[PDB]
Amino acid sequence: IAHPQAFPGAIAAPISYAYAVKGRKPRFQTAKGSVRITHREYVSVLSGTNGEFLRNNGTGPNNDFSINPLNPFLFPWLVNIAANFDQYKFNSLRFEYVPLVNTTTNGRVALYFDKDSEDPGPDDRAALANYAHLSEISPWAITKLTVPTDNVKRFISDTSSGDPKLINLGQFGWVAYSGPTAELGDIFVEYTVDLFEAQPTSPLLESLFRESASSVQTRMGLPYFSLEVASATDLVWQARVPGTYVVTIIFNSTVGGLTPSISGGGTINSSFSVSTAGSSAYVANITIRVNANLSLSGLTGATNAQLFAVRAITENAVQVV
Amino acid sequence: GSVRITHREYVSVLSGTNGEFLRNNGTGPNNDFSINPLNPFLFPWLVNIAANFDQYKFNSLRFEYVPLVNTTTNGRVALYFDKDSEDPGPDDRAALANYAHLSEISPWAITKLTVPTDNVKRFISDTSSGDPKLINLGQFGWVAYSGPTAELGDIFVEYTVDLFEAQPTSPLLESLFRESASSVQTRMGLPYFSLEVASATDLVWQARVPGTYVVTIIFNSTVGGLTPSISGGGTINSSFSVSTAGSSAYVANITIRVNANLSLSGLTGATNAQLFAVRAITENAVQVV
Amino acid sequence: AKGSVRITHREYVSVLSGTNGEFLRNNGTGPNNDFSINPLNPFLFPWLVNIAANFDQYKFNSLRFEYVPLVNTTTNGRVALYFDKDSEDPGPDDRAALANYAHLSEISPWAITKLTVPTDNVKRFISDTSSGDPKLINLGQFGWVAYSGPTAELGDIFVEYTVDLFEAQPTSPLLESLFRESASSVQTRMGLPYFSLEVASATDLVWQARVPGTYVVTIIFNSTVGGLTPSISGGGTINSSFSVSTAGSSAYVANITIRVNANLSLSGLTGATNAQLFAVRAITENAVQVV
Amino acid sequence: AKGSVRITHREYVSVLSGTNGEFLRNNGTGPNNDFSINPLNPFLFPWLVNIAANFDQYKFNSLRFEYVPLVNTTTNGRVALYFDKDSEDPGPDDRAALANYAHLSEISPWAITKLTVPTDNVKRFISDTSSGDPKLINLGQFGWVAYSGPTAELGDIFVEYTVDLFEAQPTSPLLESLFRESASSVQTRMGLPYFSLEVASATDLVWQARVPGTYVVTIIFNSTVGGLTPSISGGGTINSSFSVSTAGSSAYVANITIRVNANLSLSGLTGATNAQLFAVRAITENAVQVV
Amino acid sequence: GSVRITHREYVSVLSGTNGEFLRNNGTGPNNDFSINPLNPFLFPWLVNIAANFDQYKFNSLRFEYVPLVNTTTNGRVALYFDKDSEDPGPDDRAALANYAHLSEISPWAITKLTVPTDNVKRFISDTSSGDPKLINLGQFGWVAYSGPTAELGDIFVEYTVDLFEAQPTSPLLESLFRESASSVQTRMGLPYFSLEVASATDLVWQARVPGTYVVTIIFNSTVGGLTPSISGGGTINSSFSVSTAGSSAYVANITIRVNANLSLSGLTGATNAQLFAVRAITENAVQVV
Amino acid sequence: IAHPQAFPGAIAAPISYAYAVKGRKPRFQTAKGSVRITHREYVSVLSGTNGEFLRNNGTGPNNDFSINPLNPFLFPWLVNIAANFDQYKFNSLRFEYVPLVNTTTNGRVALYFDKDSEDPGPDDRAALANYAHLSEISPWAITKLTVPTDNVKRFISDTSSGDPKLINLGQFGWVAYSGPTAELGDIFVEYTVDLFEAQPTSPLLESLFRESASSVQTRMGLPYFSLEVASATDLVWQARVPGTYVVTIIFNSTVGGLTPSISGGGTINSSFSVSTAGSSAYVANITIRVNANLSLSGLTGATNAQLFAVRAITENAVQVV
Ligand SMILES: [Ca+2]
Ligand SMILES: [Ca+2]
Ligand SMILES: [Ca+2]
Ligand SMILES: [Ca+2]
Ligand SMILES: [Ca+2]
Ligand SMILES: [Ca+2]
Ligand SMILES: [Zn+2]
Asked if residue F275 has a cis previous peptide bond (ω within 30° of 0), the answer is no
Name the minimum distance, in Å, from the CA of F184 to any CA of chain C: 8
Name the minimum distance, in Å, from the CA of A62 to any CA of chain C: 15
Substitution target from A53, A113, A116 for chain B, most B beta carbons within 10 A: A116
Asked if F16 and A15 come within 8 Å (Cβ–Cβ), the reply is: no
Nearest-angstrom CA–CA distance, A67 and D150: 48
Substitution target from D25, D89, D123, D137 for chain A, most A beta carbons within 10 A: D89
Q: E259 to each of C243, E203, E211, how far by Cα in Å?
A: 50, 16, 11
Same domain flag for A218 and A171: no
What is F33-74 written as a DSSP string?
A: SSEEEEEEEEEEEEEE-TTS-EETTTT-S-TTSB--TT-TTT
Taking alpha carbons only, the member of F255, F256, F247 closest to residue F292 is F247
Asked if C73 and F313 come within 8 Å (Cβ–Cβ), the reply is: no
Name the minimum distance, in Å, from the CA of A218 to any CA of chain C: 24
Q: How many CB atoms lie within 10 A of CB E53?
A: 22
φ, ψ at B114 (rounded to 5°):
-95, 115
φ, ψ at A174 (rounded to 5°):
-140, 165
Asked if residue A116 is part of any domain, the answer here is yes
Encoded amino acid at F156, one letter: I
Q: C227 to each of B113, B247, C204, C249, how far by Cα in Å?
A: 56, 15, 9, 10
Q: D262 CA distance to ligand 4 centroid (A)?
A: 30
φ, ψ at D95 (rounded to 5°):
-75, -20
Last residue of a domain, one of F167, F201, F235: F201
Helix (H, G, I), strand (E, B) or coil at C289: coil
In contact, A272 and A217? CB cutoff 8 Å: no
- DSSP β-bridge partners for residue F123: none
The total number of residues written for chain C in this structure: 291
Residues 6 or more apart whose CB falls under 8 angstroms from that of D235 comprise D259, D260, D262
Asked if residue F279 is part of any domain, the answer here is yes
Taking alpha carbons only, the member of F110, F112, F132, F113 closest to residue F178 is F110
Taking alpha carbons only, the member of E156, E23, E137, E14 closest to residue E73 is E14
> Of the candidates C78, C93, C113, which has its C-beta nearest F243's C-beta?
C93
Substitution target from B21, B23, B31, B84 for chain D, most D beta carbons within 10 A: B84
Nearest-angstrom CA–CA distance, E286 and E215: 10
A242: containing domain: 202-321
Asked if residue A11 is part of any domain, the answer here is no
In contact, C15 and C113? CB cutoff 8 Å: no
Nearest ligand to residue C141 Cα: 3
In contact, B209 and B260? CB cutoff 8 Å: no
Longest dimension (CA), chain D: 59
Q: How many CB atoms lie within 10 A of CB B241?
A: 21
Substitution target from B8, B9, B12, B68 for chain E, most E beta carbons within 10 A: B68
Kind of pairing, strands A182-198 and A35-48? Answer: antiparallel
Same domain flag for F124 and F90: yes
Q: B84 CA distance to ligand 2 centroid (A)?
A: 5
Name the minimum distance, in Å, from the CA of A197 to any CA of chain D: 6
Strands (DSSP E) contained in chain C are 5-18, 55-69, 78-84, 103-107, 113-117, 124-125, 141-147, 152-168, 176-180, 189-191, 195-200, 205-209, 213-221, 230-231, 238-245, 250-258, 263-266, 275-281
Helix (H, G, I), strand (E, B) or coil at A250: strand
Asked if A119 and B169 come within 8 Å (Cβ–Cβ), the reply is: no
Judging contact as 3 or more Cβ pairs under 8 Å, the answer for D and B is yes
Name the minimum distance, in Å, from the CA of F77 to any CA of chain C: 7
**What's the CATH number where F302 sits?**
2.60.40.4030
Substitution target from A109, A118, A138, A184 for chain C, most C beta carbons within 10 A: A138
Nearest ligand to residue F113 Cα: 6
Last residue of a domain, one of F201, F219, F251: F201
- DSSP β-bridge partners for residue E238: E253
Asked if residue A264 is part of any domain, the answer here is yes
Resolution in angstrom units:
2.9
In contact, A116 and A165? CB cutoff 8 Å: yes
Same domain flag for A166 and A104: yes
Check residue C28 and report its DSSP letter.
G
Substitution target from A35, A86, A157 for chain D, most D beta carbons within 10 A: A86
In contact, C215 and C238? CB cutoff 8 Å: no
Taking alpha carbons only, the member of A195, A187, A225 closest to residue A69 is A195
Q: E159 to each of E8, E13, E162, how far by Cα in Å?
A: 7, 19, 10
Identify all chain C residues contacting B7, using CB atoms and an 8 Å cutoff: 168
**Residue D21, Cβ density class (10 Å: 0-12 exposed, 13-18 middle, ≥19 buried):** exposed
Encoded amino acid at A189, one letter: V
Q: B254 CA distance to ligand 5 centroid (A)?
A: 21
Q: B99 CA distance to ligand 2 centroid (A)?
A: 9
Nearest-angstrom CA–CA distance, E209 and E152: 18
In contact, B140 and B42? CB cutoff 8 Å: yes
Nearest-angstrom CA–CA distance, F134 and F97: 13
Taking alpha carbons only, the member of F239, F242, F258, F269 closest to residue F297 is F258
Asked if A200 and D101 come within 8 Å (Cβ–Cβ), the reply is: yes
Chain B residues with CB within 8 Å of chain D CB: 82-84, 86-87, 90, 95-100, 116, 118, 131-134
Taking alpha carbons only, the member of C149, C126, C280 closest to residue C215 is C280
Q: How many CB atoms lie within 10 A of CB E156?
A: 16
Same domain flag for F192 and F301: no
Nearest ligand to residue E100 Cα: 5
Asked if residue A182 is part of any domain, the answer here is yes
Nearest-angstrom CA–CA distance, E14 and E24: 8
Nearest-angstrom CA–CA distance, D154 and D168: 39
Nearest-angstrom CA–CA distance, E37 and E51: 8
Same domain flag for A234 and A104: no
In contact, A99 and A108? CB cutoff 8 Å: no
Nearest-angstrom CA–CA distance, E154 and E69: 10
Asked if A199 and D135 come within 8 Å (Cβ–Cβ), the reply is: no
Q: B60 to each of B114, B118, C288, how far by Cα in Å?
A: 8, 9, 40
Check residue F2 and report its DSSP letter.
-
**What's the CATH number where D237 sits?**
2.60.120.20
Q: Which residue of C has its CA nearest to B161?
A: C5
What b/e sequence results for E39-49 when a residue is b if at least 16 CB atoms lie within 10 Å of its CB, and e otherwise? bbbbbbebbeb
Same domain flag for A47 and A182: yes
Nearest-angstrom CA–CA distance, B127 and B35: 8
Q: D193 CA distance to ligand 2 centroid (A)?
A: 18
Name the minimum distance, in Å, from the CA of A107 to any CA of chain C: 5
φ, ψ at A81 (rounded to 5°):
-70, -50
Nearest-angstrom CA–CA distance, B44 and B51: 11
What b/e sequence results for F177-210 when a residue is b if at least 16 CB atoms lie within 10 Å of its CB, and e otherwise? bebbebbbbbbbbbbbbbbbeeeeebebebbbbb
Nearest-angstrom CA–CA distance, B209 and F160: 77
Cα-trace Rg, chain C: 20
Asked if C99 and F243 come within 8 Å (Cβ–Cβ), the reply is: no
Nearest-angstrom CA–CA distance, E203 and E200: 8
Nearest-angstrom CA–CA distance, D257 and D237: 5
Longest dimension (CA), chain B: 58
**Residue A33, Cβ density class (10 Å: 0-12 exposed, 13-18 middle, ≥19 buried):** exposed
- All partners of chain B with 3 or more CB pairs under 8 angstroms: A, C, D, E
Residues 6 or more apart whose CB falls under 8 angstroms from that of A214 comprise none
Same domain flag for F186 and F46: yes
Name the minimum distance, in Å, from the CA of F163 to any CA of chain A: 39
Reported as type and span, the H/E element at residue F127 is helix F125-128
Nearest-angstrom CA–CA distance, A202 and A220: 11
What is chain B written as a DSSP string?
A: --EEEEEEEEEEEEEE-TT--EEGGGT-S-STTB--TT-TTT-TTTHHHHTTEEEEEEEEEEEEEEE-S-TT---EEEEEEESSTT----SSTTTGGG-SEEEEE-TTS-EEEEPPP-S--EE---TTTS-HHHH-S-EEEEEEES---EEEEEEEEEEEEEEEEE-SPPP-SEEEEEETTTTEEEEEE---EEEEEE-SS-EEEEE-S-EEEEEEEEE--SS----EEEESS--EEEEEEEE-SS-EEEEEEEEE-SS-EEEE---SS---EEEEEEE--TTS-----
Nearest-angstrom CA–CA distance, B203 and D185: 35
Q: How many CB atoms lie within 10 A of CB C173?
A: 21
What b/e sequence results for D143-174 when a residue is b if at least 16 CB atoms lie within 10 Å of its CB, and e otherwise? bbbbbebbebebbebbbebebbbbbbbbebee
Identify all chain F residues contacting C111, using CB atoms and an 8 Å cutoff: 18, 20
Name the minimum distance, in Å, from the CA of A183 to any CA of chain B: 27
- Evaluated on CA atoms C224, C225, C226, C230, the torsion sign reads positive
Q: How many CB atoms lie within 10 A of CB C24?
A: 19
- Calculate ∠ Cα D256-D262-D265, nearest 5°: 70
**Residue E63, Cβ density class (10 Å: 0-12 exposed, 13-18 middle, ≥19 buried):** buried
Asked if C108 and F16 come within 8 Å (Cβ–Cβ), the reply is: yes
Same domain flag for A216 and A171: no
Helix (H, G, I), strand (E, B) or coil at C272: coil
- All partners of chain C with 3 or more CB pairs under 8 angstroms: A, B, E, F
Same domain flag for A146 and A258: no
Residues 6 or more apart whose CB falls under 8 angstroms from that of D184 comprise none
In contact, F79 and F195? CB cutoff 8 Å: no
Nearest-angstrom CA–CA distance, D112 and D105: 11
φ, ψ at E98 (rounded to 5°):
-75, -10
Tally of CA atoms within 13 A in the half-sphere of D132 that contains its CB: 21
In contact, C69 and C110? CB cutoff 8 Å: yes
Last residue of a domain, one of A166, A181, A201: A201
Q: E224 to each of C7, E262, E267, how far by Cα in Å?
A: 68, 17, 5
Instruction: Please count the residue pairs, one from chain C and one from chain E, whose beta carbons lie less than 8 angstroms apart.
Output: 48
Encoded amino acid at B258, one letter: V
Nearest ligand to residue A132 Cα: 1
Kind of pairing, strands D55-69 and B139-145? Answer: unpaired
Encoded amino acid at B14, one letter: L
Helix (H, G, I), strand (E, B) or coil at F217: strand
Q: How many CB atoms lie within 10 A of CB A241?
A: 24
Number of separate domains in chain D? 1
**Residue F88, Cβ density class (10 Å: 0-12 exposed, 13-18 middle, ≥19 buried):** buried
Encoded amino acid at C221, one letter: F
Asked if residue A12 is part of any domain, the answer here is no
Same domain flag for A66 and A179: yes
Reported as type and span, the H/E element at residue C50 is helix C49-52
Taking alpha carbons only, the member of B226, F34, B287 closest to residue C182 is B287
φ, ψ at B50 (rounded to 5°):
-55, -30
Nearest ligand to residue C57 Cα: 5
Q: SS3 sequence, chain E?
A: CCEEEEEEEEEEEEEECCCCCEEHHHCCCCCCCECCCCCCCCCCCHHHHHCCEEEEEEEEEEEEEEECCCCCCCCEEEEEEECCCCCCCCCCCCCHHHCCEEEEECCCCCEEEECCCCCCCEECCCCCCCCHHHHCCCEEEEEEECCCCEEEEEEEEEEEEEEEEECCCCCCCEEEEEECCCCEEEEEECCCEEEEEECCCCEEEEECCCEEEEEEEEECCCCCCCCEEEECCCCEEEEEEEECCCCEEEEEEEEECCCCEEEECCCCCCCCEEEEEEECCCCCCCCCC
Asked if residue F256 is part of any domain, the answer here is yes
Name the minimum distance, in Å, from the CA of D40 to any CA of chain B: 15
Nearest-angstrom CA–CA distance, A41 and A39: 7
Nearest-angstrom CA–CA distance, D17 and E238: 109
List the shell of residues around ion ligand 2, using CB closer than 5 Å. B 82, 84, 87; D 169
Asked if C3 and E116 come within 8 Å (Cβ–Cβ), the reply is: yes
Encoded amino acid at F42, one letter: Y
- Evaluated on CA atoms E186, E190, E191, E193, the torsion sign reads negative
Identify all chain F residues contacting A4, using CB atoms and an 8 Å cutoff: 11, 13, 103, 141
What is A207-238 written as a DSSP string?
A: EEEE-SSS--EEEEE--SEEEEE--SS-EEEE
- DSSP β-bridge partners for residue F66: F171
Nearest-angstrom CA–CA distance, B269 and C265: 32
Instruction: Please count the residue pairs, one from chain A and one from chain D, whose beta carbons lie less than 8 angstroms apart.
Output: 44
First to last CA, chain F: 66
Q: E115 CA distance to ligand 4 centroid (A)?
A: 60
Q: Which residue of C has its CA nearest to A178?
A: C70
Cα-trace Rg, chain E: 20
Check residue F82 and report its DSSP letter.
H
Residues 6 or more apart whose CB falls under 8 angstroms from that of C230 comprise C238, C241, C243, C252, C254, C264, C265, C266, C267
Helix (H, G, I), strand (E, B) or coil at A128: helix
Asked if residue F7 is part of any domain, the answer here is no
Q: C108 CA distance to ligand 7 centroid (A)?
A: 18
Kind of pairing, strands B3-16 and B122-123? Answer: unpaired
Nearest-angstrom CA–CA distance, B51 and C51: 9
Nearest-angstrom CA–CA distance, F276 and F271: 17
Asked if residue C240 has a cis previous peptide bond (ω within 30° of 0), the answer is no
Q: SS3 sequence, chain D?
A: CCCCEEEEEEEEEEEEEECCCCCCEHHHCCCCCCCECCCCCCCCCCCCHHHHCCEEEEEEEEEEEEEEECCCCCCCCEEEEEEECCCCCCCCCCHHHHCCCCEEEEECCCCCEEEEECCCCCCEECCCCCCCCHHHHCCCEEEEEEECCCCEEEEEEEEEEEEEEEEECCCCCCCEEEEECCCCCCCCEEECCCEEEEEECCCCEEEEECCCEEEEEEEEECCCCCCCCEEECCCCCEEEEEEEECCCCEEEEEEEEECCCCEEEECCCCCCCCEEEEEEECCCCCCCCCC
Reported as type and span, the H/E element at residue F287 is strand F280-288
